[PDB]
């Protein structure tokens, strides 16, 4: 709650001394779709709904 600086410890269960580990911060991937509406095009590439 205070942040990582206040408690900069990662407690891993068991004895992991001498083991190589990979630490990172989760990447928040976001993609919001456009609303699933009917799409039409004219003779050219112009779109319409």
């Amino acid at each position: 709650t205070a942040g990582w600086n206040s408690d900069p410890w990662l407690r891993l269960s068991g004895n992991l001394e001498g083991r190589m580990v990979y630490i990172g911060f989760n990447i928040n991937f976001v993609y919001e779709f456009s609303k699933f509406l009917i799409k039409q095009t004219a003779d050219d590439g112009s779109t319409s709904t």
Binding site: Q40, T41, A42, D44, S46, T47, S48
Partner: peptide, 15 residues
């Protein structure tokens, strides 16, 4: 099934 709107890119200015 009722007909769809014709896709009109149309334009501007004087016609």
């Amino acid at each position: 099934k009722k007909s769809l709107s014709v896709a009109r890119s149309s334009g501007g200015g004087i016609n």
